[PDB]
Design a protein that fits this description.
The structure is a homodimer of 285-residue chains. Chain A is of the alpha/beta class and 285 residues long. Chain A is built from eleven helices and eight strands. In chain A, helix 1 links the parallel strand 1 and strand 2. Bound molecules: ligand TXP.
Amino acid sequence: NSPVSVFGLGAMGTALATQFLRKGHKTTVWNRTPAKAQPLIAIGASHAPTIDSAAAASSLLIICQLDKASVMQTLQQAPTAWAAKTIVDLTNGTPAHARETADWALAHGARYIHGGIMAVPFMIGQPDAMILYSGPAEVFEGVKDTLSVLGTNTYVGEDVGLASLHDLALLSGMYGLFSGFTHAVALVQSANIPAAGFVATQLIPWLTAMTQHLNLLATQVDEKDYGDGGSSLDMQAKAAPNILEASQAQGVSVELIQPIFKLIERRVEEGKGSEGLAALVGMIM
Amino acid sequence: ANSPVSVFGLGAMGTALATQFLRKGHKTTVWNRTPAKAQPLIAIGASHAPTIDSAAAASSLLIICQLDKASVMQTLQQAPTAWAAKTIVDLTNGTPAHARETADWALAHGARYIHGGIMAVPFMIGQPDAMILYSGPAEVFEGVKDTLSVLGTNTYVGEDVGLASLHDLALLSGMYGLFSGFTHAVALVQSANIPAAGFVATQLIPWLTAMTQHLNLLATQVDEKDYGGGSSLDMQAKAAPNILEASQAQGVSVELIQPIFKLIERRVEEGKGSEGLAALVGMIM
Ligand SMILES: NC(=O)[C@H]1C=CCN([C@@H]2O[C@H](COP(=O)(O)OP(=O)(O)OC[C@H]3O[C@@H](n4cnc5c(N)ncnc54)[C@H](OP(=O)(O)O)[C@@H]3O)[C@@H](O)[C@H]2O)C1
């Protein structure tokens, strides 16, 4: 099957190479440090001794390194190696990082798309694994069938920085969820209530219900029509002080939840207490 | 001809409660400070009480769903002889202390008293995924739980009359985390003119659903006071600058998510970067 090369053999790059081998692709691997190659040599990979050698083995080149700086250090070490190849860069970073990297690649005669892996290394290979892609549509089309070995492809558009924007937005969502878990569990723990049962039987079911409610809020964001949905900001601005006061009586810091309470209060002070929660998005933009 | 009930407060939530009692065949008497809000309920079979006194005299099970504890006290103190030998079920949002203060007054005026927390928005009332928490004397709860089971799934959480409110405010803080995450993520995609609806339905919800299951493992680690490799705080502390920098380039404020990033960084500086997210709970206690 179609050869592939993988540059960077940390946790995610190891899993990517492993899955290409499992599906029968001739897989060439490279890493700054040689030791991380050995688990992949053990299951049939070729270890390339140089960046040049890895680039010559395949026309599809996958880069999965620490950061954009490291990607640039790899590219600049063999600047004639990239011509007429397709580079698929799965290295985490900002939208700007992806645009800057694409500029260099184009100037050196390569084709370039950026991807964001929304998945833990163990999930690689499963349909559960969402991988976002951005950059020129024709470049993606030319390699998507091979890339579909790693997970479910989701192309998100032409601007090569979009996959990173989507990735970082999803991670922001997760950091909010974790903020809520932390505050809720601290409050019950302050009254010597075990965390396990509370989370399994009360917090997860409640978060599941409100996670579905997010589709209503998203519709209201698009329509710029911030109806209350039966839960007005005026009413919420009376429950939030109670959450703060009980937290303080229990000795629990309010640092993780006070920001959104100040937003809710600001909207009431603008005269729009009869709206609902979809109004907050525009306030931080 | 089912067991009579009285409902005090006909805002969005109180309207839904009264509606459900009528739908299930109960003689339902209703009262509101602003009397016009009774008319949609008279239209579906309710009796409108002209006074607090008359609403209290119509039933033995008396439900109050107004705004805050101050409002409940204003209602109680207007007819101090009306409450004797009744069961008051107070579903009005407040702190644990508010529930204890209210119960003291009720007991002194010859009433029985339970406090509850409605974990549902109005349209959810009557469906299986509506959870209502209850606390106070177990025999008082026993006397009315079958009637109350019309609103949702009863969850008794103990005898201290303040416990339902502690549980309620903890679950609400969980939800405000989730909503902080939605708000930041949708602002990021909206800053690049991406519709909220498709992103939320096909990318954000499935991601949040996966990460929600991970919360069981974190809760176990909280109980065992044993945190963690896994996803070490050290790695998380590498995603955060990418999210902050991309937010700044897009003109999106970081006020909703910066707190958790600062907590994480404090734990790394204590020498415990190899621990996991469950360590955060103890830090805010
Ligand atoms: N909606 C949701 O998503 C629910 C989520 C879980 C439960 N949650 C709680 O349940 C109650 C009622 O909420 P609702 O949305 O109905 O509030 P409003 O629509 O603003 O109605 C407030 C009511 O409180 C009364 N209220 C307000 N102040 C008073 C006083 N002082 N005395 C008596 N009654 C009072 C007011 O009477 P009014 O219509 O303004 O005349 C209304 O009947 C409140 O404590 C909420 O925190 C709500």
